């Protein structure tokens, strides 16, 4: 049947919200009040891939945009990009590997590991207003844990 999707927001474990930073980048900042309308709403699709109780393969699209987070090599490194797609073909159950994240539940938070690049994670910096990036380090300065809020 169709692929199933949920609308959601993400916050990092320091409680920073995610916003657009130009057309193909996201940034994380501290947000509260009227400014919370600026946050990005995701359409999280539940996609084909290796699965376990606590490891669920998803794609992260921007709500009602033909834009997905994806993991590609850039100037030779796993990086996070926003990638355009053909809007008549997406989302789909069998998403290409660069679009797939393993959504991992650990200690009442979530981590999003690249299915394409094991042990690389959606990350934020401790500083305000810096890019969301694909980070090969857990337990350092880079923040790799999030909470999800389910949106109408």
Domain span holding position 17 = 1-152
Residue 39 pairs in a beta bridge with 19
- Looking up residue 41, the CATH number of its domain turns out to be 2.80.10.50
Which experimental approach was used here?
Answer: X-ray
Phi, psi of 24 (to 5 degrees): -130, 25
Three-class DSSP labels, the chain: CCCCEEEEEEEECCCCEEEECCCCCEEEECCCHHHHHHECCEEEEECCCCCECCEEEEEEEECCCCEEEEEEEECCEEEEEEEECCCCCCCCCCCCHHHEEEEEEECCEEEEEECCCCCCEEEECCCCCEECEEECCCCCCCECCEEEEECC
Q: How far is CA 48 from CA 2, 9, 51, 101, 102, in A?
A: 12, 22, 9, 11, 11
80 CB neighbour count, 10 Å cutoff: 22
The Cα–Cα gap between 59 and 83 comes to 12
For the chain, what is the domain count?
1
């Amino acid at each position: 049947a169709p692929v199933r999707s949920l609308n959601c927001t993400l916050r990092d474990s320091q409680q920073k919200s995610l916003v657009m930073s130009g057309p193909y980048e996201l940034k994380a900042l501290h947000l509260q009040g009227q400014d919370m309308e600026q946050q990005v709403v995701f359409s999280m699709s539940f996609v084909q891939g290796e699965e376990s109780n606590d490891k669920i393969p998803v794609a992260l699209g921007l709500k009602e945009k033909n834009l997905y987070l994806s993991c590609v090599l850039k100037d030779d490194k796993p990086t996070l990009q926003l990638e355009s797609v053909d809007p008549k073909n997406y989302p789909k159950k069998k998403m290409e590997k660069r679009f797939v994240f393993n959504k991992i539940e650990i200690n009442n938070k979530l981590e999003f590991e690249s299915a394409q690049f094991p042990n690389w994670y959606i990350s934020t910096s401790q500083a305000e207003n810096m890019p969301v990036f694909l980070g090969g380090t857990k337990g350092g300065q880079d923040i790799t844990d999030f909470t999800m809020q389910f949106v109408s």
